[PDB]
Each structure stands twice: as structure tokens, then as C-alpha cells.
Structure 1
Amino acid sequence: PSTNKHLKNNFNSLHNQMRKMPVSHFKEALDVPDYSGMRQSFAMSQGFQLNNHGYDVFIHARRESPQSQGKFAGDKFHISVLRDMVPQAFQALSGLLFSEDSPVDKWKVTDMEKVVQQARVSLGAQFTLYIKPDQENSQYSASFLHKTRQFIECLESRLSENGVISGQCPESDVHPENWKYLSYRNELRGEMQRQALREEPFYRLMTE
């Protein structure tokens, strides 16, 4: 009994219901900080609590959305861009990342200054997007999965429309041919571990 079991058992059902749903739209937000402002935040932007603590290399963003009642199943995404274009990528994505319609309640961005201070290799994953089922019982609803897939793809093209240079996907992640910045990983689960992810029902529902 688990989130992944419900997925395996409704695998085709979720896939068919999802492809039949109309494009979902996200009202992007404008009253948002730009990267430099984020580097220097404790503050709050449209529901998301912003935190930068030093024992980290990230600036965290978390919204206490009282709807996502499910429990974390380890599903998350990364966004990889050339280290130098983090500020350009962040600005481009800010409208969505802070959107009231975004399905992602918790995410983080690499803080370039702390990346230098802590001599951290920044070739990829400057952004991390956390995801968990919407249903109190921890099962992903087809409507939620669809919105999440639409969201991720909205991220993808917003980045390429802005000519953002692709980064290097973390070796512990997987991604389709059509994902130039986005990659997937499930932390609750070598290139053996990568094919494991590739057959993950959640990942396949975001890809095929």
C-alpha cells in the first residue's frame, strides 16, 4: 500500500485520463523578486516563505498550501542551466515558480555566492522542484499529475524561448530526449539506478 502502488495499478488509467485533459493554465505572478533580491532575503513572496541560511547553498521557497494533503513519495525535479545564466533563468521562471496555480509548493534555487564560498560544483541542478500527491490518502489524482506535467513543460519552453543555455544533468537523474533542462529523480529509491528511474511509473506518466 503506497503512492507508487496506486500508480502501478492505475498506470494506463491515469495516462488516458491525462491525455484527454485540456491545457491547464497558470496565472504567472509579477510582484516577485528578481534573483539578486532572492540572494538577499527572511521574507515572503506571494505565499512562499523564502529562506537563505548559510549551512546551505540554496535559497528555499515553501508555500504552506493547505490542500496538498498527501505525504511525500520522493518525487522531485531538477533544472539544469549553465551556471552563469542562473539569474536569467530564475527571472524567466519567477512568474511560474511563484504562480498561485503552480503545483509545486516547495522548491529551491542555488545561491551563486554561497556556491563560490563553499566551492560547490555548479554544472547542473541549480533549481530543485519538490512534488507530493494531492489526495489526503497520498494518491496522485489524474488532474494533479496532468497539471504537474503541464507545469514542468511550461518551465522547459520558457527557458528555451529565452535562449537559456542548457546545463549538465546530474548523473543520478534521468530525462527524455525532449527535456533540455528538466530531469527527474526519486530520492526514496549506478546507471543501473538510472534505468530504475526510467521505468518509474511517475516518471513515465510525465514523459509518454
Structure 2
Amino acid sequence: STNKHLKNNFNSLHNQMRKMPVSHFKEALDVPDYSGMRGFFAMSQGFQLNNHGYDVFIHARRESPSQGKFAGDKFHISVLRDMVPQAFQALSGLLFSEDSPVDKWKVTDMEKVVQQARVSLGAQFTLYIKPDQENSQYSASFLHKTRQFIECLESRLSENGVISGQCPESDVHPENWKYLSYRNELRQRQALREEPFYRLMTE
């Protein structure tokens, strides 16, 4: 499995990642603004956008490319509900970037959260991660890119004075992540902190 490989290459992956140069993400400009996202079924930078009325989100899935099978890894971004539009705009360049390692994500539609009487304290953004290789093994290059990406998101939000939200109860995050949090749906918060993926993303 994917996790088996991470465990047996734990130090090797870490050692390669920690010596790689900073990643560069060519951010997108020709993207929709938040109100645009609420369009309904359009295309933007290769990402198929979809807003149906059965949930409180707007989904984005890149028609491409990651060749591996889902291993359950994903991140959530939590901000004050009032600031979702600002957060979205600030992160749009990276989220729609051709260099982004995230092929699938979603953002809550505040109109729909109100119509469906849902609470929105956090996890307004969800980022799905999948091994890049066909054999379902994460490569050192990809993990480094993903970590770099997640950190750019963190920095962009704080530089924009976005007020943080409330981390989901089932997620875990280090003290230096103010918006991002992690969880693996395929497997206690204590156990998540031990996941190799999570530790390679934080230590």
C-alpha cells in the first residue's frame, strides 16, 4: 500500500525533501471571483467547476492528470466564515495554478450553508491529495511540492490578515499551521499525528 511505502522510506523521503529548492507555483489570474463561483458548471484553468444544489460546496476537479490511487490524505482550511470570500480570492491563484499538486478541492458556498442551515466554523476548504505515481507511491518530489503548496496557502492567508476559523474535531495540525489541518478518512487525533504523511508535512 501507499502507507507501507511511506513507513519504509520515511527517513529517505524526508532527507530528499529537506534538501530540495523552494517550489515555484505559477499562479492563475484568469480565474473566477467568489461570487462567480456561486459559475454553476464551467471550466477554469483545466479545473471542472461544479455547483449543484445537493451540498454546500463548489467542487473543482482538474480534467487531468497524479496517477496513483487515493490513500485518504486530505487537508482542510479553516477561516472565519465572514472572510471566506477574501480567503477564496487570496488563494485562487494557487488553487487554480497549473503547478498545484492538488487536482481536486472544494470551497463552501456561503449562500447554500445558510439555506441548508449548516454551521460554518471551519473546513471551508477541502484539499484532496493522491499519490502521483502509478504504483500509488508518493514521490519525494511530489510530497515536497505538496508541503510547499500547503505552506504557501498558510502564508497567503496570514499575509492577507484572514482571521482563522475552528479546526475540525477530527483533524490535527502543528502549532505553526493557523488555517490548515490534516486528516485521513481511511484511518483518535493521537494516531493521526503519527501518520508518516502528516509528519513529513510538518517536521
User: Same fold by TM-score, threshold 0.5 exceeded?
Assistant: yes
Please give the residue correspondences for 1:63-74 in structure 2 after superposition, counting only pairs within 5 Å: 63-66=62-65, 68-74=66-72
**CA–CA distance in structure 2, aligned partners of residues 154 and 40 of structure 1:** 26
In structure 2, relative to structure 1, the CA distance for the partners of 1:197 and 1:12 (3 Å cut) is same
RMSD: 0.5
Pick one of 87, 90, 108 that aligns with 1:89: 87
| Deviation, structure 1 residue 80 | 0.1
- SS for the counterpart of 1:49 is strand
Structure 2 distance, partners of 1:26, 1:157, is 14
Percentage identity across paired residues of the two chains: 99
Task: Give the secondary-structure state (helix, strand or coil) at the position aligned to 1:152.
Answer: helix
How many angstroms does 1:64 deviate by?
Answer: 2.1
Distance (whole Å) between structure 2 residues aligned to residue 58 and residue 64 of structure 1: 19
Contact 2:49 2:60 in 1 (8 A): yes
May I ask how many residue pairs the two structures share in their alignment?
203
For residues 9-28 of structure 1, the aligned pairs below 5 Å read 9-28=8-27
Separation (CA, whole Å) in 1 of partners of 2:185 and 2:4? 17
Using the size of structure 1 for normalisation, the TM-score is 0.97
Secondary structure in structure 2 of the residue aligned to 1:206: helix
Shift of 1:40: 4.0
Q: Which consecutive segments of 4 or more residues in structure 1 shift more than 4 A?
A: none
CA offsets 1:56-98 (integer angstroms, 9 cap, x no match): 10000000222x1100000000000000000000000000000
Task: Give the match's secondary structure for 2:202.
Answer: coil
Structure 1 residues 125-144: Cα deviation after superposition (integer angstroms, max 9, x where no partner): 00000000000000000000
Report the CA distance shift for 1:40/1:64 in structure 2 as closer, same or farther (over 3 A).
Answer: closer
8 A Cα contact 2:16 2:140, kept in partner: yes
Secondary structure of the corresponding residue to residue 60 of structure 1: strand
TM-score (norm 2): 0.99
- In 1, Cα distance between equivalents of 2:200 and 2:117: 37
SS of structure 1 residue aligned to 2:127:
strand
Q: Secondary structure at the match of 2:61?
A: strand
Structure 1 Cα separation of the partners of residues 165 and 84 of structure 2? 10
Q: CA deviation at 1:41?
A: 2.3
Unaligned runs of 5+ in 1: none
How many angstroms apart in 1 are the aligned matches of 2:173 and 2:17?
A: 20
Aligned 8 A contact 2:79 2:164 in 1: yes
Give the aligned partner of residue 177 of structure 1: 175
